């Protein structure tokens, strides 16, 4: 009966992490406290269960600029009393497009979460994910 879902909006941040921030603003979703966005880093669930989890991530970069290796993004899960762990991951190869060329990334997948479970999107260089409206989002809905 109680729908549990959450769509949160990307939020840039001076902090130092490869873990992306999110804000409960704009046209977002947060059906209730049965799902809660804490620390602006992850989404935590209070009810065990199956959930469809996703994160849309577009970023803007350059071939040689950071060049290095690709730009991988990963949907991570951190269950209580368990070490972290990776659920999904997408990865593209920096375009040349100067100054930077955007590129998008998308990852879903159904999972079973233990009560207290909590997920977070993490990328290789947040200093370059794109935050224009509608670009980078993250969220989950329970079946």
């Amino acid at each position: 009966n109680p729908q549990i879902a959450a769509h949160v909006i990307s939020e840039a941040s001076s902090k130092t992490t490869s873990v992306l921030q999110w804000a409960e603003k704009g046209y977002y979703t947060m059906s209730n406290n049965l799902v809660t966005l804490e620390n602006g880093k992850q989404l935590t669930v209070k009810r065990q269960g199956l959930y469809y989890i996703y994160a849309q991530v577009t970023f803007c970069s350059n071939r040689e600029a950071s060049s290095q290796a690709p730009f991988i993004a990963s949907l991570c899960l951190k269950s209580p009393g368990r070490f972290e762990r990776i659920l999904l991951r997408a990865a593209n190869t920096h375009s040349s497009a100067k100054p930077c060329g955007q590129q998008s990334i998308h990852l879903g997948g159904v999972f079973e979460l233990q009560p207290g479970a909590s997920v977070f999107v993490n990328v290789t260089d947040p200093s370059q994910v794109s935050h224009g409206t509608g670009f980078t989002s993250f969220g989950l809905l329970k079946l």
Partner: antibody
Amino acid sequence: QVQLVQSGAEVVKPGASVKLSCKASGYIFTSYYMYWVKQAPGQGLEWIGEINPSNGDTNFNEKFKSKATLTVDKSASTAYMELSSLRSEDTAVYYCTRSDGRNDMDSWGQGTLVTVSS
Amino acid sequence: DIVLTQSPATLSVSPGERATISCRASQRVSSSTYSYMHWYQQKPGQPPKLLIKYASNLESGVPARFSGSGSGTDFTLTISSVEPEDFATYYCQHSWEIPPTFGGGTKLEIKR
């Protein structure tokens, strides 16, 4: 001290184009989105756009998508605004300011008076 | 675009008088943990100076008289007891979405 030093005032004839610059300092340049705000005589504060300097990536207020062109010189820790095809109502003071997590805009350049007249 | 309406447009207070301006969102801009509202004071000739961010936290350096509250669509900013320097004009501004947009402004005039 964290400071942003905007360029000198500009007087320009309609239809021309001007390229405003803003030199940040006192902090890590690439770690802040640099915004731009226009304030016209009597007219209020208007947000033009945003530029991540690390990136080159930008985002404009639709209402100005045509007038502005945000760009930055990561190396020189500087951002630049290029207003083009200036009508007369384009006259005002253009402020470059450091957004703090793209929310509160916490530091501003002196401002640049762009006055466009024949 | 969200539209913020401040009020009064002019608030005439004397030094030693407490003053509180109010802002207004055409829509809620405060969610479950934060209210994306900020206030600036701006003097003639100068650019705005950030005083309060996220509806109620003093920016670094702002003096304690300055304070702010509110949520959803209404917010206030209030100096506990006006001081000469305080006379200026104030803008409230959100950050709920693109484009951020500023309120009309309120001048904090000197009663006399």
